C-alpha cells in the first residue's frame, strides 16, 4: 500500500503534469512521464532533460556603466574574450548586453566582483 | 489523523478473579508487560 | 586463474572540479533520455 | 556526506542533474534567492550581512548541538528500543512457561 | 535503506580548498583535513553525543 | 523504512536542489540543506 500510494503520487505529478521536484520523476530535469501497465505494477517512462558538452566561461555578478550597476534580468553574465554576453543558465545562447535583459539597481561600488563594459541601449540608434 | 486510545490490564483480562493470580503472573505476565508497552506506545503515537 | 576475491567498496569515481570564483560552466548541448521506474 | 557537501557548495544543484556545472558561490546563493521571490540584487548588495548571518547561524546550531540535551532523542529511541527488545527476549527465555 | 538515503549520486567529489566562498564559512560542516577521518566538527559532536 | 524514504526524499530535493514546498525543507523560505551523518540516521541543516 505504501508503494501503491507512491505510484499514484507519481501518476498524479509526473503523468498529469510536470514536476519541479528533483529526482522524483526522473534522473534529471523532468519533462514528461508515460505510464505503462504491468503485472501487479506500473512501469513509468520518465523522459528528462540532461545537458552535456559543457564549456567554462568567466562571469561577473554585475556590470558597471555610467556609475550604475546592471544586473541580469534573466540568465548569467558570461565572457570568453573581451565581449560580455548574457545567456540563460541552462543553455548557451549568447546575447549582447542590452537594457531590455539587464536590471539596474544601485551603483557599482557597493557590490564586489564587478566588471566594467558597455551596456547597450536599444533606443538611441533609432533616435 | 487519530485513533481512539486503548489500554489493557493484565490481571483483569487473563487473571480476573483467579485465586492463583501469582501462578498466572510469574510464568505468563511478561508477555502482557510487552503488550502494555506496545499499547502505551500506540497511545503516545496517537497524541503526537 | 579464476577465483572468489574480496575487495573494498568502490565508493565512486573521483571527480575533480574547481570552484574558483569567476568561472561558470554552461551546457552548450543537451541530451534527452527516458528512464524506466517500476513500482508494484 | 562530504561528496554531497562538495557538490552542493561547488556545483550548486547541477550535480544532481547533469554533470556538476561549477558556479561561483555568491552566485549560487543569489540564484537561490531568486527561487524565493527576492531579486538577486538584494543578496549582492548585502553579501557581507548574509555571510555573517550564515556564520552566526552555523555557530548557534553547533552550540545547540553541543549542550548534551540535544534533540537527538528520536535517534536514541531506535537503539534504546532495540536493546530493550533483545534484553526482554533473553529475560523471556529465563521463564519456565 | 542506508544505500538509497546516502548514495543517490555515486560521483564522489573532493573538498575544494576553503578559500573565498563569498565570506560563507564552511569549516563546521566540511570535513577538516586535520584528522584522517572524513568527519566534520558538528558530525563529531553528533557521533559523540 | 518509512522514515528512511522520507529522509531520502529530503536528500533528493532539499540537498540536491531547492524546494518550493513550504515547511517541508525547513521553517521559512528554504535556500539549501547541508547533509550531516549520524549514528543510524541523517541530520539535516535546513538553512532558510
Ligand atoms: C567569444 O565568443 C564570441 C562569440 O562570437 C566571439 O566574438 C567574436 O569577436 C571578434 C572580436 O575578437 C569579432 O571580430 C567577431 O565578429 C565575433 N564573432 C565571431 C563569430 O567571431 C569572440 O571572439 C570569442 N572570444 C574568444 C577569446 O574566443
Ligand atoms: C576571486 O578571488 C581572487 C583571489 O584569488 C580575487 O582577487 C578576486 O577579486 C575574487 N573575485 C571575486 C568575484 O570574488
Ligand atoms: C569599473 O569598476 C571598477 C571597479 O574595480 C572601477 O575601478 C572603474 O573606475 C569602473 N569604471 C569606470 C569607467 O569608472
Ligand atoms: C547536440 O546533440 C547531439 C549530441 O548528443 C549531436 O548529434 C548534435 O550534433 C549536437 N549539436 C551541437 C550543435 O553540438
Ligand atoms: C572559517 O571559520 C574558521 C572557524 O571559525 C576560521 O578559523 C577560518 O578562518 C574561516 N575561514 C576564513 C577564510 O576566514
From Swiss-Prot, chain C:
Precursor of the fusion protein processed in the biosynthesis of the S protein and the formation of virus particle. Mediates fusion of the virion and cellular membranes by functioning as a class I viral fusion protein. Contains two viral fusion peptides that are unmasked after cleavage. The S2/S2' cleavage occurs during virus entry at the cell membrane by host TMPRSS2 or during endocytosis by host CSTL. This is Spike protein S2. Glycans are attached at residues 21, 29. It comes from the Viruses. The chain holds residues 689 to 728 of 1273 of the full protein.
Amino acid at each position: 500500500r505504501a508503494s501503491a500510494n507512491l505510484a499514484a503520487t507519481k501518476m498524479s505529478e509526473c503523468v498529469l503534469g510536470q514536476s519541479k521536484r528533483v529526482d522524483f520523476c526522473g534522473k534529471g530535469y523532468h519533462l514528461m512521464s508515460f505510464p505503462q501497465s504491468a503485472p501487479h505494477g506500473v512501469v513509468f517512462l520518465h523522459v528528462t532533460y540532461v545537458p552535456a558538452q559543457e564549456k567554462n566561461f568567466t562571469t561577473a555578478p554585475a556590470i558597471c556603466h555610467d556609475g550604475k550597476a546592471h544586473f541580469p534580468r534573466e540568465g548569467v553574465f558570461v565572457s570568453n574574450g573581451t565581449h560580455w554576453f548574457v545567456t540563460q543558465r541552462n543553455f548557451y545562447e549568447p546575447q549582447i548586453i542590452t537594457t531590455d535583459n539587464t536590471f539596474v539597481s544601485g551603483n557599482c561600488d557597493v557590490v564586489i566582483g564587478i566588471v566594467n563594459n558597455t551596456v547597450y541601449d536599444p533606443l538611441q540608434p533609432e533616435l | 489523523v487519530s485513533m481512539t486510545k486503548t489500554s489493557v490490564d493484565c490481571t483483569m483480562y487473563i487473571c480476573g478473579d483467579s485465586t492463583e493470580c501469582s501462578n498466572l503472573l510469574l510464568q505468563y505476565g511478561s508477555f502482557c508487560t510487552q503488550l502494555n508497552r506496545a499499547l502505551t506506545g500506540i497511545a503516545v503515537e496517537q497524541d503526537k | 586463474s579464476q577465483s572468489i576475491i574480496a575487495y573494498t567498496m568502490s565508493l565512486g569515481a573521483e571527480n575533480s572540479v574547481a570552484y574558483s570564483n569567476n568561472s561558470i560552466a554552461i551546457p552548450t548541448n543537451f541530451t534527452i533520455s527516458v528512464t524506466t521506474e517500476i513500482l508494484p | 556526506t562530504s561528496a554531497l557537501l562538495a557538490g552542493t557548495i561547488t556545483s550548486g544543484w547541477t550535480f544532481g542533474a547533469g554533470p556538476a556545472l561549477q558556479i561561483p558561490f555568491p552566485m549560487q546563493m543569489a540564484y537561490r534567492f531568486n527561487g524565493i521571490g527576492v531579486t538577486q540584487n538584494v543578496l549582492y548588495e548585502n553579501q557581507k550581512l548574509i555571510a555573517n548571518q550564515f556564520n552566526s547561524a552555523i555557530g548557534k546550531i553547533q552550540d545547540s548541538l553541543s549542550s548534551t540535551p540535544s534533540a537527538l532523542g528520536k535517534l536514541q529511541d531506535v537503539v534504546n528500543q532495540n536493546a530493550q527488545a533483545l534484553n526482554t527476549l533473553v529475560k523471556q527465555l529465563s521463564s519456565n512457561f | 535503506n542506508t544505500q538509497e538515503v546516502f548514495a543517490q549520486v555515486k560521483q564522489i567529489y573532493k573538498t575544494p580548498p576553503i578559500k573565498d566562498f563569498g565570506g560563507f564559512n564552511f569549516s563546521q560542516i566540511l570535513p577538516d583535513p586535520s584528522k584522517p577521518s572524513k568527519r566534520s566538527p558538528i558530525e563529531d559532536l553528533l557521533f559523540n553525543k
